Design a protein around this ligand. Structure first.
Ligand SMILES: Nc1nc2c(ncn2[C@@H]2O[C@@H]3COP(=O)(O)O[C@H]4[C@@H](O)[C@H](n5cnc6c(=O)[nH]c(N)nc65)O[C@@H]4COP(=O)(O)O[C@H]3[C@H]2O)c(=O)[nH]1
Ligand SMILES: Nc1nc2c(ncn2[C@@H]2O[C@@H]3COP(=O)(O)O[C@H]4[C@@H](O)[C@H](n5cnc6c(=O)[nH]c(N)nc65)O[C@@H]4COP(=O)(O)O[C@H]3[C@H]2O)c(=O)[nH]1
Lengths: 141, 141
């Protein structure tokens, strides 16, 4: 679990998705634009799925390649108001071994959601459009 | 599209997923061994998904991150015998606009499968694990 102590750029370098010169160029650009590093690398050719798998490794989330098969448990969605699910980007979908399963849209929100839910939870990560489709399934109307 | 005219090394270089030095070493080893180039590159640290994304662009295939969302259509599976689907590494999964949708395990087989099917087809490419999971669902023993 040593990947949780790595910077994003280092994780992608170790995997081989970017070169050291591309990373330095990206950090140089960031110093003047303020954009997130991952957004710059994606614009420069990194697949968004590769970006999210690295961010999932960094924060201890399970990346979901697909949300199409999930049937959200209504009892789990009760654990967050719809307005909170939207604002925190978090969808409770079910339960495993006394933990609530929660699908995040942004790995940076893991800590704020965990503190709020205040109970054992297992966190997943989904790309924006898969997250949005799951959210409407779980929190209709 | 003009991507179909490029060598694999050229495609990886233009996408920024391989260095010129790493490609040259792999091509020199291949002169000595005859191994498939992408096999040498992945062994030297190229992400397998980078290899498959490049090979998909080269053969005009859509790369599939996951097959877990696919519900294989039984009538499409009739278009190949199970033994053929396995030998050719091809799973017919459905139909769209009068084309059969077919998920391949190896882009080098696209031409052999297309001639056999002998009808309009749209081809996809999936990583080995995702392919095998789809095949087992489409063609139970
Ligand atoms: N939803 C989303 N989240 C993203 C994205 N990119 C990064 N995140 C995460 O947001 C945190 C802050 O990203 P940053 O603003 O680019 O701020 C970065 C960045 O300025 C820099 N950095 C990242 N990687 C490297 C590296 O390899 N070497 C060096 N010298 N600095 C790095 O260190 C700071 C902290 O990096 P991290 O620990 O990895 O923490 C990162 C990462 O967890 C994105 O595109 N989308
Ligand atoms: N499923 C799968 N398919 C793979 C893999 N590696 C290559 N393929 C594909 O198989 C064809 C033959 O690969 P090769 O024997 O290594 O034979 C290659 C290789 O010897 C060489 N080559 C590839 N890229 C370059 C390059 O950038 N520069 C130079 N000078 N030669 C290259 O030219 C030949 C033609 O390569 P391509 O037109 O790209 O056609 C390649 C590519 O379509 C793999 O690991 N898995």
């Amino acid at each position: 679990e040593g990947q949780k102590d790595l910077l994003l750029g280092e994780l992608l370098l170790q995997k081989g998705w970017i070169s050291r010169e591309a990373l330095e160029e990206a950090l140089v650009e960031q110093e003047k634009t303020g954009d997130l590093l991952g957004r710059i690398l994606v614009r420069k050719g990194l697949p968004e799925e590769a970006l999210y798998r690295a961010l999932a490794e960094q924060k201890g989330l399970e990346f979901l390649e697909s949300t199409e098969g999930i049937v959200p448990d209504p009892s789990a969605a009760l654990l967050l108001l719809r307005s909170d699910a939207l604002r925190y980007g978090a969808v409770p979908i079910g339960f495993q071994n006394g933990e609530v399963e929660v699908v995040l849209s942004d790995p940076r929100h893991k800590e704020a959601v965990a503190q709020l839910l205040n109970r054992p939870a297992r966190f997943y990560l989904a790309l924006p459009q898969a997250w949005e489709e799951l959210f409407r399934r779980a929190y209709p109307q």
